[PDB]
Amino acid sequence: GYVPEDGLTAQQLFASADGLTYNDFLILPGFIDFIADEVDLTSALTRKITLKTPLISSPMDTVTEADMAIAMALMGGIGFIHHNCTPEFQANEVRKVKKFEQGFITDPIIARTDLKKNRDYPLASKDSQKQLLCGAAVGTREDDKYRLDLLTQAGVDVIVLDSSQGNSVYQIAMVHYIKQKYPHLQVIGGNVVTAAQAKNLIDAGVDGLRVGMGCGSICITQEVMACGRPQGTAVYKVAEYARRFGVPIIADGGIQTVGHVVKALALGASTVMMGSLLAATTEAPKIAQGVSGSIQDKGSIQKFVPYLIAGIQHGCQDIGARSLSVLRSMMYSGELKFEKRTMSAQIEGGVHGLHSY
Amino acid sequence: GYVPEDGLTAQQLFASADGLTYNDFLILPGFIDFIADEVDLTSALTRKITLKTPLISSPMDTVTEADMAIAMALMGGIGFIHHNCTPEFQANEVRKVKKFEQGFITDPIIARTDLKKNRDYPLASKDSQKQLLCGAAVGTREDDKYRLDLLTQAGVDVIVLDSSQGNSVYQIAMVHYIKQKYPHLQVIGGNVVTAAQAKNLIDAGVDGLRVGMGCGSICITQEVMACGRPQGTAVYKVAEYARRFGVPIIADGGIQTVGHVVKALALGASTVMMGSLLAATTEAPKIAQGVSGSIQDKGSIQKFVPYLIAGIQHGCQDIGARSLSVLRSMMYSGELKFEKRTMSAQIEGGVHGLHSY
Amino acid sequence: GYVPEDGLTAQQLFASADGLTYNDFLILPGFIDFIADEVDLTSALTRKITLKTPLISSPMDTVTEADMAIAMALMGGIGFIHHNCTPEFQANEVRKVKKFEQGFITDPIIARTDLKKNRDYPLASKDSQKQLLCGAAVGTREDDKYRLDLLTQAGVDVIVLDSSQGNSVYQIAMVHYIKQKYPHLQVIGGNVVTAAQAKNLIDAGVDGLRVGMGCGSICITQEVMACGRPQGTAVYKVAEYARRFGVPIIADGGIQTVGHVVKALALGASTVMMGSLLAATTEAPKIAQGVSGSIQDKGSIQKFVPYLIAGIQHGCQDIGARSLSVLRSMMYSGELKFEKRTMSAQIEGGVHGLHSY
Amino acid sequence: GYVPEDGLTAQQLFASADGLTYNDFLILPGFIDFIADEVDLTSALTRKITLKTPLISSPMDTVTEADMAIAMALMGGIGFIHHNCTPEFQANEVRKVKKFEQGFITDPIIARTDLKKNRDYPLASKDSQKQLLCGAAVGTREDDKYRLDLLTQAGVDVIVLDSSQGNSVYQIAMVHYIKQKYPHLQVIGGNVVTAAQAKNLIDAGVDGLRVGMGCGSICITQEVMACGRPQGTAVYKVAEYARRFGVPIIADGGIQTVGHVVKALALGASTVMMGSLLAATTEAPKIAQGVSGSIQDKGSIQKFVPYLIAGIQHGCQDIGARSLSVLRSMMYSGELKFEKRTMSAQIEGGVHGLHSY
Ligand SMILES: NC(=O)c1ccc[n+]([C@@H]2O[C@H](COP(=O)([O-])OP(=O)(O)OC[C@H]3O[C@@H](n4cnc5c(N)ncnc54)[C@H](O)[C@@H]3O)[C@@H](O)[C@H]2O)c1
Ligand SMILES: NC(=O)c1ccc[n+]([C@@H]2O[C@H](COP(=O)([O-])OP(=O)(O)OC[C@H]3O[C@@H](n4cnc5c(N)ncnc54)[C@H](O)[C@@H]3O)[C@@H](O)[C@H]2O)c1
Ligand SMILES: NC(=O)c1ccc[n+]([C@@H]2O[C@H](COP(=O)([O-])OP(=O)(O)OC[C@H]3O[C@@H](n4cnc5c(N)ncnc54)[C@H](O)[C@@H]3O)[C@@H](O)[C@H]2O)c1
Ligand SMILES: NC(=O)c1ccc[n+]([C@@H]2O[C@H](COP(=O)([O-])OP(=O)(O)OC[C@H]3O[C@@H](n4cnc5c(N)ncnc54)[C@H](O)[C@@H]3O)[C@@H](O)[C@H]2O)c1
Ligand SMILES: O=c1[nH]cnc2c1ncn2[C@@H]1O[C@H](COP(=O)(O)O)[C@@H](O)[C@H]1O
Ligand SMILES: O=c1[nH]cnc2c1ncn2[C@@H]1O[C@H](COP(=O)(O)O)[C@@H](O)[C@H]1O
Ligand SMILES: O=c1[nH]cnc2c1ncn2[C@@H]1O[C@H](COP(=O)(O)O)[C@@H](O)[C@H]1O
Ligand SMILES: O=c1[nH]cnc2c1ncn2[C@@H]1O[C@H](COP(=O)(O)O)[C@@H](O)[C@H]1O
């Protein structure tokens, strides 16, 4: 009645200072004793918001403009309104997000079409009354403090502070300002990749952290600047540290299939920012450290996100985890076991042996 | 108030005999508490010359002929006049470099256009007289001793001794000859890659070393000869040794973006020789162990080098280093931390997931 | 419902090439669902004898002369008659062992006192009929071939070939001689310590091996000759090899408590030879690579061996092994777990903190 | 027909930088197919002397006066006459070694008692004549150059240069002097413990090396001076280097049993130098870095050295080595295998479990 324990526990992957990303490892399967589609996907975007689906849409002008934020909230995720735009435009934009369905309408009462929407979209993320949740990016420059006023009067729930570095005196100063002036506004950090720099943002009072820098599909920062972290290592090594204080970690960049979503959610992160996978769907709109564009068409979101939700929850089922909180327990108790891959051992992931596919 | 030490200190990368190059590692970010464009870039080229910008242009006929040496000096860097040419031509060439702007003109007084140039180009590298700095390559063969006379009477400041191996009895003999006959002329070694061979050139009296052999975009030496060193390991392991005596190390070859410049300067090198990145700009002109040519056009230098200077000093800011001397301190005190990458973990550096770019 | 695997599996101790011995490790406890004394203690002395208790008495003139061999057989173990004596004396000695109780007495019928002995000593080791089992040592010299005749006509069951080295051309030759001339006689090897030398004795046709050389309380061989093996490593590394062919391994020398008996029987050995622990009991009688004597009195055997049998079977109970065959299964399946000790971690074995004991 | 490789090869012990001595390891036994006492025990002492036994008596006032040097040469070994005495006494002393038995007596012819001695002592080490071999120590202070004259006119064959450090400019100078003035005199370098310092003595033209410093029973030096090696590591690491050029290695100090003689010769020394094991035999005679004396009576040397010769050659037989040249052939081919001892596996060398011994 004894059987050896195959594979590294989570801490034993990252005990070698080796720089793994999501491609470099696998999760060992475990005992299925539950039906394929009853696992619970609720995850925290900050200490005080739960989303009924862990998928976030990245604050960039190519992805979330006016309608991605609507759909992601109907689908129990969220969006962050971009900010390479005039502040009045962005504020009007989050306003036309918040008003899309309502409980007690204050500045047009109730309605019946809104209740039909409530019946049709059961996962929808709704704050209070019945309106949709929405976030936005705000910059770090001094003149962007004006934008907070328009956003606040426009009913935004949460904000990211956008900059490629989170551990700067300016971003900390901005977190202090927001947290002393607008105590109902939850704020989210700036692309951290190490526990020693997540500390300063946590002490400032940041209510959730997005993690990863210079790893991404449209993003060239590492290969032009030297700073970065292999983002599958980053998401574990910082969520190990942020879990002590309770702030959630949102995985950010390089997520280019469902497998990478499941790996990020097994390693510790609470939710995931999709960029270039959600870009070029139906409803998407002095040195240079970015890339121009060109993502191919990817259909309609309302038929796309359910595929992501079915894939992610099939992965959780076959790993053996009855919910995402159980998946993080199996991770931190050492019950999940992982295997490395040699470069060559990745090719038998369906890549070769066919004339076309 | 305790947080772990994420990543290898500098010495712990190269403690494994593993052959790293600039692609194989990343630098962990650190605290920004200074503005992005005030970090000091002054770097030594020999024990007795400082450049106001760490960028050098490689002595080859495809890069620096007559005008690259002018521009690099105006931009606070330098050039070395190539030497696959008749000695009189090369001497006339460094002469037409020195005369481009002047203090007291001896063999035409002063001028006003020269002072306008002084106002327009504030970084320019100059003698005590307002004339530009210039170096030259000189060969190792006996008959090339004649070239030293023309170069000396032509007002050259410094020389490289060209050959692909520096640790030869002939190059040492040539360093002794120059240092006993022309004591004002600073001399630079021949492409060393190990402390045990930098010793002989240092004892001869070499005033700076270029480091790296058979690693560089146009050079096939390793793949036809067996001798060489992974050049990111070479620059550290030899600058660890040369720092004791004070001679500068200049990193040489394979620098094909700004990230490689920042990595080379973080590892110990004082300055960097650009070849094929500066080749094919506006102002650029029995076995065979080199490659034919064909580099695409790269615009004008006066608008190109400032991009390099902005990128490099952005990298230094985000690492947290207030100057290049502070960057080398954070390196040798073990305060900089580095991560390895698997081959697979390099691909998420913006390479893939796009239809075109 | 997950809990880590504390301690090294058996193979993970001896995969470190560091020369462990019984003092230098511990066995981790395991689940008990059975009473202290039900565990089955039967073990094989050769491929074709089972003993109802695993203790053997060492063939030396200080231990087994005439009565130790009687008692050990009454107690379900065995003895080997010594051989530093005249062959006629030894043969008469094993004869006066075999005759001590009988079935059909051939050369005096049956008796009633013999059946009373059969009632009183239920563990007693007996061949066909009801006589006691007995072994003897025989030498390796040519003139000792005569002794085999007297021993054979005297009714010995099994023999050891005595020499301190087993892997010699002479011992192999002697095994062949005995196995072609007396096919009923089982023969036992000469103090082997490596699989590469157990091979030759196994191929000769040896039916069990005694393992260990130059480790033992009276034995100085290592400290005067250089040859040997740390005997707790020896017993595992050779029983890992002999188990393939089926021959049993008997652990030999350095057993100075019950803990060492249990450790030897966990590591693979089937039975154990006791020398200086059974020496100086009530019923015990050109270079020099041995020691003179002086073992203090140790009482009567009939009250001593049951203490050994209670201790050994208590150790098996607390490890959780329901029999000695289950204990070897838990060993080779990797279910037993072991811990090393630093030198400094052995003193807390009841040695210190007391004025007297 | 396959069986694993039990134990470390020779190079795999000392690849761990952990400072083993003779007590810290064992040699694995091997196949015997030869009789106990036929193994060829000849060894080189310098490039141009063979001894019919590897034991040497150490140059000290408590071991080597003429009575010892005689008895060792009769027993096929040697002695080095001590040198803390007046030069005339030492010269007279080696003269009374040489004259003890003769071929053609020049300054009294032949004799019959000398031929009786030749019949009685068959192993005796002798010149090209029949007179016994003798070495001596000579110092390295300049006034000791006088002693070389008396020793040379007295017929000494070989000399050690005695000083506790061999790698000094003075000992090198003395080797050059002797080798240019007295080319028939073989000279032995003093107490080296590293290949990097044996090089200078071999380049000076030393004809054999004494190896070990600060390890030895009367010698306190490591515990007073900081310099030294674990002498079982030193004898391997230096014989590995000296074997390239052909100079013999004599293992000096810490030899306190026959096992240590066999271990030194397995590790690659040609001969072994005995102090305290021969001190107090019947015919043995400003900082302090030595100990006073007090060694107990060791009996008569003609009945003692045959016990060393039987033990050393029994050890070789059981390792399986048919001669000492075969023992060093099995060493450097990696055919000998060694086991480390944990501290708690040395006690089992017959030390414990007895009331007296
Ligand atoms: N879409 C996203 O999620 C995302 C993520 C990262 C970066 N970005 C974008 O990347 C682009 C490149 O810029 P970046 O983000 O790398 O750096 P940035 O433009 O935020 O900042 C550039 C430099 O200026 C400094 N700076 C910023 N605010 C400052 C202030 N108030 N006072 C003084 N200095 C200040 C920063 O510390 C940094 O050193 C920007 O357009 C940004 O919006 C977007
Ligand atoms: N652009 C550069 O920085 C750069 C760097 C290396 C080589 N090169 C060029 O590549 C070509 C080959 O150069 P190389 O350095 O590989 O070899 P080289 O042409 O300098 O030397 C060729 C051979 O001659 C030997 N040699 C050189 N000088 C000698 C002397 N005075 N006396 C005796 N032997 C001598 C060398 O050891 C070598 O075996 C040359 O045209 C050189 O200018 C240019
Ligand atoms: N009590 C025991 O279980 C036990 C165990 C080991 C040794 N011993 C005793 O140790 C004592 C010391 O001797 P030992 O056993 O170490 O070695 P041994 O007496 O078996 O052999 C001594 C030498 O003779 C050689 N030899 C043995 N038989 C030979 C033959 N037929 N032909 C030629 N050469 C032969 C061996 O190779 C060895 O060199 C002996 O009295 C022996 O009985 C007893
Ligand atoms: N019995 C032995 O085989 C044995 C082995 C080693 C040392 N010793 C003894 O140890 C004792 C302590 O002395 P030691 O051997 O440690 O060192 P030492 O007395 O030989 O030398 C002491 C110092 O004087 C230096 N010295 C030697 N010759 C010199 C010269 N010509 N000019 C200048 N300096 C010179 C040495 O290099 C050293 O630094 C001596 O009596 C020596 O004989 C004996
Ligand atoms: O210009 C840029 N600088 C820094 N980060 C960027 C930039 N553009 C995109 N990103 C990152 O790219 C992520 C989108 O995921 P991706 O499509 O997998 O790369 C965003 O959430 C950002 O973290
Ligand atoms: O023919 C050659 N042999 C050896 N080294 C060369 C040769 N041509 C160029 N180099 C090296 O190539 C470096 C430039 O490399 P790059 O910047 O990658 O193009 C120069 O500074 C030289 O060190
Ligand atoms: O003289 C001897 N030489 C070699 N081995 C011996 C000698 N005497 C006893 N032994 C070994 O010592 C073992 C008993 O060790 P003990 O139980 O610790 O006393 C015996 O079974 C033999 O293997
Ligand atoms: O005063 C001393 N200084 C250094 N070495 C010494 C001194 N006296 C004796 N020796 C060494 O002490 C060792 C004693 O040899 P052992 O008695 O066989 O261990 C030999 O190697 C001697 O060369």
PDB file of N, CA and C in Angstrom, chain C residues 1-49:
ATOM      1  N   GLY C   1      -5.463  16.103   3.268  1.00  0.00           N
ATOM      2  CA  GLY C   1      -5.142  14.694   3.392  1.00  0.00           C
ATOM      3  C   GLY C   1      -3.791  14.318   2.817  1.00  0.00           C
ATOM      4  N   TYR C   2      -2.866  15.276   2.746  1.00  0.00           N
ATOM      5  CA  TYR C   2      -1.518  15.094   2.240  1.00  0.00           C
ATOM      6  C   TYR C   2      -0.544  15.432   3.350  1.00  0.00           C
ATOM      7  N   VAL C   3       0.512  14.635   3.452  1.00  0.00           N
ATOM      8  CA  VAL C   3       1.565  14.786   4.454  1.00  0.00           C
ATOM      9  C   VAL C   3       2.935  14.349   3.891  1.00  0.00           C
ATOM     10  N   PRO C   4       4.015  15.138   4.040  1.00  0.00           N
ATOM     11  CA  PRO C   4       5.290  14.874   3.375  1.00  0.00           C
ATOM     12  C   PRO C   4       5.964  13.548   3.730  1.00  0.00           C
ATOM     13  N   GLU C   5       6.892  13.102   2.889  1.00  0.00           N
ATOM     14  CA  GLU C   5       7.684  11.889   3.109  1.00  0.00           C
ATOM     15  C   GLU C   5       8.954  12.190   3.934  1.00  0.00           C
ATOM     16  N   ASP C   6       8.880  12.154   5.263  1.00  0.00           N
ATOM     17  CA  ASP C   6      10.038  12.386   6.144  1.00  0.00           C
ATOM     18  C   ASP C   6      11.097  11.276   6.036  1.00  0.00           C
ATOM     19  N   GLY C   7      12.341  11.630   5.715  1.00  0.00           N
ATOM     20  CA  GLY C   7      13.505  10.739   5.790  1.00  0.00           C
ATOM     21  C   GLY C   7      13.856  10.012   4.494  1.00  0.00           C
ATOM     22  N   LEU C   8      15.085   9.512   4.411  1.00  0.00           N
ATOM     23  CA  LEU C   8      15.628   8.861   3.225  1.00  0.00           C
ATOM     24  C   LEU C   8      15.030   7.467   3.064  1.00  0.00           C
ATOM     25  N   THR C   9      14.601   7.078   1.872  1.00  0.00           N
ATOM     26  CA  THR C   9      14.384   5.654   1.598  1.00  0.00           C
ATOM     27  C   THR C   9      15.700   4.887   1.668  1.00  0.00           C
ATOM     28  N   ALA C  10      15.682   3.568   1.817  1.00  0.00           N
ATOM     29  CA  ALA C  10      16.890   2.778   2.048  1.00  0.00           C
ATOM     30  C   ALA C  10      17.997   3.031   1.030  1.00  0.00           C
ATOM     31  N   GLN C  11      17.659   2.994  -0.254  1.00  0.00           N
ATOM     32  CA  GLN C  11      18.597   3.244  -1.344  1.00  0.00           C
ATOM     33  C   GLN C  11      19.215   4.655  -1.316  1.00  0.00           C
ATOM     34  N   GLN C  12      18.505   5.661  -0.810  1.00  0.00           N
ATOM     35  CA  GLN C  12      19.000   7.030  -0.715  1.00  0.00           C
ATOM     36  C   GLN C  12      20.009   7.236   0.428  1.00  0.00           C
ATOM     37  N   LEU C  13      20.100   6.364   1.448  1.00  0.00           N
ATOM     38  CA  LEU C  13      21.248   6.368   2.373  1.00  0.00           C
ATOM     39  C   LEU C  13      22.512   5.977   1.616  1.00  0.00           C
ATOM     40  N   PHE C  14      22.537   4.754   1.096  1.00  0.00           N
ATOM     41  CA  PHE C  14      23.746   4.118   0.580  1.00  0.00           C
ATOM     42  C   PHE C  14      24.127   4.548  -0.847  1.00  0.00           C
ATOM     43  N   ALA C  15      23.284   5.333  -1.527  1.00  0.00           N
ATOM     44  CA  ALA C  15      23.667   6.109  -2.705  1.00  0.00           C
ATOM     45  C   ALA C  15      24.660   7.231  -2.378  1.00  0.00           C
ATOM     46  N   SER C  16      24.736   7.689  -1.123  1.00  0.00           N
ATOM     47  CA  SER C  16      25.877   8.484  -0.658  1.00  0.00           C
ATOM     48  C   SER C  16      27.039   7.545  -0.304  1.00  0.00           C
ATOM     49  N   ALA C  17      28.188   7.716  -0.952  1.00  0.00           N
ATOM     50  CA  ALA C  17      29.341   6.830  -0.812  1.00  0.00           C
ATOM     51  C   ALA C  17      30.184   7.170   0.441  1.00  0.00           C
ATOM     52  N   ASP C  18      29.597   7.029   1.632  1.00  0.00           N
ATOM     53  CA  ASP C  18      30.147   7.564   2.887  1.00  0.00           C
ATOM     54  C   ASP C  18      30.314   6.539   4.022  1.00  0.00           C
ATOM     55  N   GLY C  19      30.117   5.246   3.762  1.00  0.00           N
ATOM     56  CA  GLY C  19      30.521   4.193   4.693  1.00  0.00           C
ATOM     57  C   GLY C  19      29.731   4.109   6.000  1.00  0.00           C
ATOM     58  N   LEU C  20      28.402   4.140   5.954  1.00  0.00           N
ATOM     59  CA  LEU C  20      27.545   3.986   7.132  1.00  0.00           C
ATOM     60  C   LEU C  20      27.753   2.649   7.854  1.00  0.00           C
ATOM     61  N   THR C  21      27.450   2.615   9.150  1.00  0.00           N
ATOM     62  CA  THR C  21      27.477   1.445  10.049  1.00  0.00           C
ATOM     63  C   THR C  21      26.292   1.530  11.001  1.00  0.00           C
ATOM     64  N   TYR C  22      25.888   0.471  11.703  1.00  0.00           N
ATOM     65  CA  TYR C  22      24.628   0.456  12.456  1.00  0.00           C
ATOM     66  C   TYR C  22      24.449   1.619  13.429  1.00  0.00           C
ATOM     67  N   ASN C  23      25.510   2.098  14.060  1.00  0.00           N
ATOM     68  CA  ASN C  23      25.435   3.245  14.956  1.00  0.00           C
ATOM     69  C   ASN C  23      25.033   4.545  14.240  1.00  0.00           C
ATOM     70  N   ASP C  24      25.195   4.629  12.925  1.00  0.00           N
ATOM     71  CA  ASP C  24      25.213   5.875  12.160  1.00  0.00           C
ATOM     72  C   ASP C  24      23.890   6.227  11.469  1.00  0.00           C
ATOM     73  N   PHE C  25      22.815   5.484  11.730  1.00  0.00           N
ATOM     74  CA  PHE C  25      21.470   5.766  11.223  1.00  0.00           C
ATOM     75  C   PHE C  25      20.373   5.262  12.169  1.00  0.00           C
ATOM     76  N   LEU C  26      19.135   5.684  11.953  1.00  0.00           N
ATOM     77  CA  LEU C  26      17.933   5.236  12.664  1.00  0.00           C
ATOM     78  C   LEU C  26      16.835   4.875  11.670  1.00  0.00           C
ATOM     79  N   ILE C  27      15.844   4.085  12.072  1.00  0.00           N
ATOM     80  CA  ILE C  27      14.651   3.783  11.272  1.00  0.00           C
ATOM     81  C   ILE C  27      13.487   4.618  11.807  1.00  0.00           C
ATOM     82  N   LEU C  28      12.725   5.284  10.947  1.00  0.00           N
ATOM     83  CA  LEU C  28      11.534   6.030  11.351  1.00  0.00           C
ATOM     84  C   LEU C  28      10.419   5.068  11.804  1.00  0.00           C
ATOM     85  N   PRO C  29       9.689   5.363  12.889  1.00  0.00           N
ATOM     86  CA  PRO C  29       8.540   4.576  13.299  1.00  0.00           C
ATOM     87  C   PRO C  29       7.402   4.611  12.271  1.00  0.00           C
ATOM     88  N   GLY C  30       6.457   3.684  12.391  1.00  0.00           N
ATOM     89  CA  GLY C  30       5.304   3.551  11.501  1.00  0.00           C
ATOM     90  C   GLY C  30       4.076   3.000  12.227  1.00  0.00           C
ATOM     91  N   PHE C  31       2.952   2.888  11.529  1.00  0.00           N
ATOM     92  CA  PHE C  31       1.675   2.582  12.164  1.00  0.00           C
ATOM     93  C   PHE C  31       1.639   1.178  12.782  1.00  0.00           C
ATOM     94  N   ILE C  32       1.127   1.069  14.009  1.00  0.00           N
ATOM     95  CA  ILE C  32       0.892  -0.201  14.705  1.00  0.00           C
ATOM     96  C   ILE C  32      -0.609  -0.516  14.718  1.00  0.00           C
ATOM     97  N   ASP C  33      -1.024  -1.652  14.152  1.00  0.00           N
ATOM     98  CA  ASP C  33      -2.372  -2.202  14.357  1.00  0.00           C
ATOM     99  C   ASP C  33      -2.372  -3.622  14.939  1.00  0.00           C
ATOM    100  N   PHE C  34      -1.273  -4.038  15.562  1.00  0.00           N
ATOM    101  CA  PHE C  34      -1.096  -5.386  16.088  1.00  0.00           C
ATOM    102  C   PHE C  34      -0.356  -5.414  17.424  1.00  0.00           C
ATOM    103  N   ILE C  35      -0.625  -6.456  18.208  1.00  0.00           N
ATOM    104  CA  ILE C  35      -0.078  -6.671  19.550  1.00  0.00           C
ATOM    105  C   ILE C  35       1.424  -6.975  19.505  1.00  0.00           C
ATOM    106  N   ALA C  36       2.118  -6.719  20.608  1.00  0.00           N
ATOM    107  CA  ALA C  36       3.571  -6.703  20.708  1.00  0.00           C
ATOM    108  C   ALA C  36       4.307  -7.958  20.205  1.00  0.00           C
ATOM    109  N   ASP C  37       3.693  -9.141  20.261  1.00  0.00           N
ATOM    110  CA  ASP C  37       4.396 -10.426  20.182  1.00  0.00           C
ATOM    111  C   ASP C  37       3.844 -11.409  19.137  1.00  0.00           C
ATOM    112  N   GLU C  38       2.929 -10.998  18.262  1.00  0.00           N
ATOM    113  CA  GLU C  38       2.403 -11.879  17.205  1.00  0.00           C
ATOM    114  C   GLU C  38       3.281 -11.947  15.943  1.00  0.00           C
ATOM    115  N   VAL C  39       4.304 -11.096  15.807  1.00  0.00           N
ATOM    116  CA  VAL C  39       5.056 -10.979  14.548  1.00  0.00           C
ATOM    117  C   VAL C  39       5.896 -12.211  14.245  1.00  0.00           C
ATOM    118  N   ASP C  40       5.792 -12.726  13.023  1.00  0.00           N
ATOM    119  CA  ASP C  40       6.467 -13.961  12.620  1.00  0.00           C
ATOM    120  C   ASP C  40       7.970 -13.747  12.365  1.00  0.00           C
ATOM    121  N   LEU C  41       8.807 -14.464  13.111  1.00  0.00           N
ATOM    122  CA  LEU C  41      10.248 -14.248  13.212  1.00  0.00           C
ATOM    123  C   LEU C  41      11.079 -15.312  12.473  1.00  0.00           C
ATOM    124  N   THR C  42      10.477 -16.131  11.611  1.00  0.00           N
ATOM    125  CA  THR C  42      11.187 -17.172  10.851  1.00  0.00           C
ATOM    126  C   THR C  42      12.135 -16.597   9.804  1.00  0.00           C
ATOM    127  N   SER C  43      13.324 -17.175   9.637  1.00  0.00           N
ATOM    128  CA  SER C  43      14.317 -16.735   8.643  1.00  0.00           C
ATOM    129  C   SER C  43      15.096 -17.892   8.030  1.00  0.00           C
ATOM    130  N   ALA C  44      15.620 -17.735   6.817  1.00  0.00           N
ATOM    131  CA  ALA C  44      16.384 -18.772   6.123  1.00  0.00           C
ATOM    132  C   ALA C  44      17.902 -18.696   6.389  1.00  0.00           C
ATOM    133  N   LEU C  45      18.532 -19.789   6.833  1.00  0.00           N
ATOM    134  CA  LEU C  45      19.984 -19.896   7.003  1.00  0.00           C
ATOM    135  C   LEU C  45      20.701 -20.264   5.702  1.00  0.00           C
ATOM    136  N   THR C  46      20.101 -21.136   4.898  1.00  0.00           N
ATOM    137  CA  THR C  46      20.457 -21.361   3.485  1.00  0.00           C
ATOM    138  C   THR C  46      19.173 -21.400   2.659  1.00  0.00           C
ATOM    139  N   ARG C  47      19.242 -21.620   1.342  1.00  0.00           N
ATOM    140  CA  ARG C  47      18.036 -21.817   0.507  1.00  0.00           C
ATOM    141  C   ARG C  47      17.067 -22.914   0.994  1.00  0.00           C
ATOM    142  N   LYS C  48      17.509 -23.839   1.860  1.00  0.00           N
ATOM    143  CA  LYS C  48      16.774 -25.059   2.237  1.00  0.00           C
ATOM    144  C   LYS C  48      16.767 -25.383   3.739  1.00  0.00           C
ATOM    145  N   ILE C  49      16.952 -24.389   4.609  1.00  0.00           N
ATOM    146  CA  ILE C  49      16.703 -24.501   6.061  1.00  0.00           C
ATOM    147  C   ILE C  49      15.971 -23.252   6.548  1.00  0.00           C
TER     148      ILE C  49
END
